[PDB]
Design a protein around this ligand. Sequence first.
Ligand SMILES: CCCCCCCCCCCCCCCCCC(=O)OC[C@H](COP(=O)(O)OCCN)OC(=O)CCCCCCCCCCCCCCCCC
Ligand SMILES: CCCCCCCCCCCCCCCCCC(=O)OC[C@H](COP(=O)(O)OCCN)OC(=O)CCCCCCCCCCCCCCCCC
Ligand SMILES: CCCCCCCCCCCCO[C@@H]1O[C@H](CO)[C@@H](O[C@H]2O[C@H](CO)[C@@H](O)[C@H](O)[C@H]2O)[C@H](O)[C@H]1O
Ligand code: SF4
Ligand code: SF4
Ligand code: SF4
Lengths: 360, 70, 182, 106, 156, 97, 176, 318
Amino acid sequence: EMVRKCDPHIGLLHRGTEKLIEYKTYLQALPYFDRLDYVSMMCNEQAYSLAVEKLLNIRPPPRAQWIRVLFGEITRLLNHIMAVTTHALDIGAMTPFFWMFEEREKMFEFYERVSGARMHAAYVRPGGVHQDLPLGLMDDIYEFSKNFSLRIDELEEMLTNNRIWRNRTVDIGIVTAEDALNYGFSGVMLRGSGIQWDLRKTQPYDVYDQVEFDVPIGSRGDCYDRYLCRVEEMRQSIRIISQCLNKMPPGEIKVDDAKVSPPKRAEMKTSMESLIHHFKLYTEGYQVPPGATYTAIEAPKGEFGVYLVSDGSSRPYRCKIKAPGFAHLAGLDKMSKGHMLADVVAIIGTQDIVFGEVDR
Amino acid sequence: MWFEVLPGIAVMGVCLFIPGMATARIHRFSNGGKEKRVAHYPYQWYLMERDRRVSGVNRSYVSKGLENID
Amino acid sequence: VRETFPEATIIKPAEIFGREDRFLNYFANIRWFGGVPLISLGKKTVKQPVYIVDVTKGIINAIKDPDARGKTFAFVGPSRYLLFDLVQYVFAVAHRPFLPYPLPHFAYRWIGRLFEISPFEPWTTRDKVERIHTTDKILPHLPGLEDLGVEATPLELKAIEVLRRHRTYIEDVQPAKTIPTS
Amino acid sequence: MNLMLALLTNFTLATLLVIIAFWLPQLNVYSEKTSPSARLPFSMKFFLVAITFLLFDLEIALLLPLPWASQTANLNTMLTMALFLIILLAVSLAYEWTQKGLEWTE
Amino acid sequence: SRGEYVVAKLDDLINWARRSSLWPMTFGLACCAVEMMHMAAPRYDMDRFGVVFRASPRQSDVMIVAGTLTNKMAPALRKVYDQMPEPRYVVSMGSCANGGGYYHYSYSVVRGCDRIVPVDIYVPGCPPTAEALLYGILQLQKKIKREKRLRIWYRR
Amino acid sequence: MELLQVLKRGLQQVSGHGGLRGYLRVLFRANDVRVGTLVGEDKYGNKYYEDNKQFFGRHRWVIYTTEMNGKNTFWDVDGSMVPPEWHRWLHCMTDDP
Amino acid sequence: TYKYVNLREPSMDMKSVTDRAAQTLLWTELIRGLGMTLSYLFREPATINYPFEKGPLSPRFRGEHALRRYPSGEERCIACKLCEAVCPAQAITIEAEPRADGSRRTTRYDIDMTKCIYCGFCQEACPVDAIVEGPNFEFSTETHEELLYNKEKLLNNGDKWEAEIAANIQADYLYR
Amino acid sequence: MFMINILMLIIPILLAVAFLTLVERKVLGYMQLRKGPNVVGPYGLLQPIADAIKLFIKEPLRPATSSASMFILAPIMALGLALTMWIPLPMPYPLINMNLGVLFMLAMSSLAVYSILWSGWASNSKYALIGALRAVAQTISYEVTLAIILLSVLLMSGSFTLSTLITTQEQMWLILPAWPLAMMWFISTLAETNRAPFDLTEGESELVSGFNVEYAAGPFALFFMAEYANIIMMNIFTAILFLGTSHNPHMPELYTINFTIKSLLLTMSFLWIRASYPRFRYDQLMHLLWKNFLPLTLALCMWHVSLPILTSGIPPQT
Ligand SMILES: CCCCCCCCCCCCCCCCCC(=O)OC[C@H](COP(=O)(O)OCCN)OC(=O)CCCCCCCCCCCCCCCCC
Ligand SMILES: CCCCCCCCCCCCCCCCCC(=O)OC[C@H](COP(=O)(O)OCCN)OC(=O)CCCCCCCCCCCCCCCCC
Ligand SMILES: CCCCCCCCCCCCO[C@@H]1O[C@H](CO)[C@@H](O[C@H]2O[C@H](CO)[C@@H](O)[C@H](O)[C@H]2O)[C@H](O)[C@H]1O
Ligand code: SF4
Ligand code: SF4
Ligand code: SF4
């Protein structure tokens, strides 16, 4: 019954994204980030946008930043529903998947109403967001958020105290704090083992230092504590979304610098300067001053970062993507030691692995 | 709605009901409108064999009462 | 065809073997019944089968060859075999027990008729038996694969490719005896 | 006679369903495909669960007559020997349990 | 009572059974698999059409290729296809499977799964919406409904 | 008494579809016997219904024509049969038909 | 600020120990899970009756492409090639020349719909609203070749869908 | 006349199995906030027919079997035994009235493990055989409690005659005096029939569970029918054993209606459970049997031998 060695063979979804990005302008490369961790689309966009904005030495306007936090946390709910329910579905508990994917279906509507796409929105961009929220959207997000914690409670009623669920998760895949750090874990893989770390708290970006939330911390570093952390993080996202809805400011939604963000279509059709800048931004693109940055965010699956190198032109020179699931899967052999074959399925689930980001 | 599950359950119910109803009716058809005789022990079988002889038609379920007394 | 389209290229191949052939697979599937009949004892029948890819390359090379127009080719394999040796070799490669037994045509025509009753591809028919037991003509007045720049592929190099699926689950194989070349 | 007829009918139908389940697809005439002792290694634990089942199953053979045994006049003797058998069945389990005969960890 | 009539009605029966009981083997390769999962989810409930959600490749009748097919993965996809019992159909879901999509010019990507297996339905989108995929599945059902296997057999 | 009001509604749907023959036509074409307000009809014969008491997503629907562009669509219906003017309403891209 | 998700030490008195024993032996927490699935059995399902009912969309939805005209019927596209330059997938191929009347118009406008990622960048880049992504998402095909749209196909899509496309643009152009 | 009786049992059994597949999909559907089959026939009533036709005209799988005889024997054994389990059931009258009918049902079910073993042997796959052996180990393990639990209940009934269970429960369901045995009995039937949360043959921990793995198997439909016939039969047996229906000799149909409802409800609970719980690990379901059910079942067997004697409630022998 016992697993002695676990050798993951990946690359089955390696699509040479990093080499493709070197042939795209910075705007053209943005949609590649939707297709990495393709469960956390807008969080991937935010990371890339922050990195480019840093090299550009510009900052997006306040309303865009609140929109980016609002949809970042909606995206965390999207990811955690997937993480928890597919974790449950793969060990036989199929029903929560169906209940919660109806909730995912309604958050896909928020994606589609702001961007016109259900998943690969391409909505968060360097300089802000592509378009402002349509009238009536915040009311619908409020109505969704009002009932969501009940949906979480129903999920917990199925799993949290279930002895079968606890038997499958408790003391499975224990990770010590010191090992979690040296193996390069992040996100819940760290907090499950008691490490008090969360980039939104410690290295905040956008307006995360203006919202109140608590970081759930585990005590045993096993699959069950990581499951509890993810479920509790969903509650905190609802708590954050509640503040974003109330504190959403007025104003423009992309930086008012037409050498980076395209002008409004009405301006493009009346002003000579606007038309030139529209023409150049959609052909050459904006040039980015030479330099290199490592920019990271607390993505739903852990620390997601890009090492972005600019040579001074309108196309990136190098873009290395740091996917949290890459280091996590690299630790599968370590975590599966002394466990049974059925436990490897539970351990892969608790790592929350999407091969889009692992293989790029 | 949940009551659209019932039609398939009704079909299941009718299918499960048929074997029990058929056996009861066929037994009474084959034993002169009475329950089929149960003979788990030699004494019961001995009486059934005696009834088959007493009937005069070689059927143990044909009962002879005081009309045969004289 | 030669009267209707005088410049036609006519290709006259021998029995063709290959993964989807009805030749080696035919003999392999005779084993599916205990009897393994043979006109005479598989003697008096010499076969010169040709590999499917060789025929294909010959056809393709004929399309590209201005010389090939209006000609008639004969596509044959490199080695001539006795029908008994071929079938014996086929069973040896398929790791099957080989049980020959003689038969004349009249008793081989009724089995052919008996399976002709099927409403699909018959397992065998009288006509198939007559063709299998027809000795392959030698036609030295016609050009062949070598005239089109194709090297005929030996059957021994490709039998495993075809018959590996017919095996039940050291590779002595024993190459079949070839009739001395002309 | 009736039981023999029932068994014959049940296994006859099962046989017909099996052969037609194997012949009916041949009506399609699908294309040909042309494209595919010793230890297992067997774990001792899987052998020992089978053996334990057998020995427990033999003790159950001795317990099956209990419904009839309760009709006896010597109830004290019968009850003593019935509890004796079940207790030894429990003692077999306790011995297996405390020597880790019921573990699945290697 | 011609043979054309009987063959015609027998075709309709087997076509009805096969399209009414389509068991997919979803090859969830990348993002498109998420939308495929939203087609099984409550709003669209593919199971209500007779399309069972998770079916083993041994009993599957249709393979849905949902995502990018890389070179390293192409042999394994062809192996599953070769092991599918007939009749078997392939639905190509999304730009990547259709023709390479965003990664068309990559050194590691197969430029459309139809270089590896024959494809019956192409569903466009990046990703196609769950409803778009359902539309494509219903399109395959009508394609099966049009089949004439027995009529062609009768005229051989 | 609630159980009886439910039965009345069930039989009221039979009358709402024009009798048993009409009720079975919709049941077998569309696997749905709900009665809604007729919003309009397009030039191909598609009929559009709404029922605002239904939950969002089931509050609007179309019963497809049985014949479109010479094609018999009694059984063979297709989302592509909805013309663009109604497509916007049926997908809730707008409120007004 | 942080919270512990699992750091409660169970009480060890009779009342509590026996409550946990009852749960173990009487399966009470398992029965509770049965109650939740039973409650769902009596809820109305969320399933819509596709294709008679359709999932809701918005005017911004990015679907099948189309080339548009001015009210006079003149093409909007003046072959600037901003769409072809911005296309992240290089899905657009354009050729152009002076038309007979001297107008600047395309002679080729192809979109490989199997390269396209349906990002909508082309319609953002277009200075005259010529190329758009319309609302149609039900255009799956039986062959790969049918998804390689040339200019004729795209103009036909514009004429086919303009009634809906114009209304959707009217509803969202003030956000653009 | 008897031949009619046999067919009036076999054919309805096959139809109930067919439409249980529809009930399972719709019940699981509504617990998952969806509908399940409602397109193929009204309310999906034709869906079982479409599936049946589709499966029987499907191409047979590859690879070839290791043993042709065992490949053919396994499905015959599974289905032949499944139908045989129904012949002594009193509904209220049995097709075959056996004095030892309960023992007959135990004996026949213990033979159902051979189809698992033979199909693993005929799979021509080392990993598929190992999967079959794990399934056998599960089946025989839970047979131990079923036999001991059954013996404990019969100490209140007094014989091995199935129709005597009806008389035993004339005043009261046996579930009241024996609810602890009923609980373990019901779970054992789930584990015995490889039903969720004990469906490890369909789980994620098997060496052959990988989708891309292949081995000789089939026909799928015949094995599936045999399994679902056993699900219904076990739940019918459970109703008779613990929820005895009153029998009026002049109105036997009333017994059958009430008895059918109880069996249906118990069968629906199998579907209920499948929708509600995750799956056991193989070592954990072994632990459940050997370290929980078995110690408690032995203790309750001691109790039920002693209880009738000490209360002066020994049942009659005849
Ligand atoms: C006056 C004195 C008279 C003397 C007699 C007195 C006896 C009464 C007191 C004893 C009560 C006995 C209760 C009988 C049930 C058996 C209890 C049991 O074994 O359950 C515990 C078992 C293991 O529990 P676990 O927490 O995982 O680990 C503990 C071991 N370390 O865990 C389980 O078994 C949980 C079940 C696993 C299967 C879960 C899926 C099924 C759940 C839904 C079932 C719904 C109820 C079914 C009822 C059917 C009835 C027909
Ligand atoms: C297909 C569906 C068919 C159904 C159709 C509709 C009818 C529905 C009827 C089903 C009834 C069950 C559904 C309701 C269950 C939910 C109720 C519930 O959640 O109770 C939870 C309760 C508290 O549990 P907990 O929070 O852990 O508290 C522990 C310390 N107090 O936990 C408890 O208090 C549990 C108390 C009961 C424990 C009993 C243990 C099992 C004993 C087995 C006896 C079985 C007898 C019934 C069998 C049927 C025969 C009639
Ligand atoms: C006259 C009657 C003739 C017999 C008719 C038989 C019809 C059978 C219809 C089955 C309907 C589908 O039913 C569904 O099938 C799939 C198998 O693919 C099962 O699926 C289950 O088994 C397979 C393996 O076998 C697993 O891969 C799967 O994860 C598991 O859920 C479902 O548990 C079952 O609910
Ligand atoms: S087509 Fe689009 S959504 Fe689908 S896998 Fe490719 S990039 Fe992802
Ligand atoms: S939607 Fe995006 S990928 Fe498609 S043609 Fe337009 S710019 Fe190119
Ligand atoms: S569609 Fe628009 S952007 Fe593209 S070439 Fe024509 S005018 Fe320029």
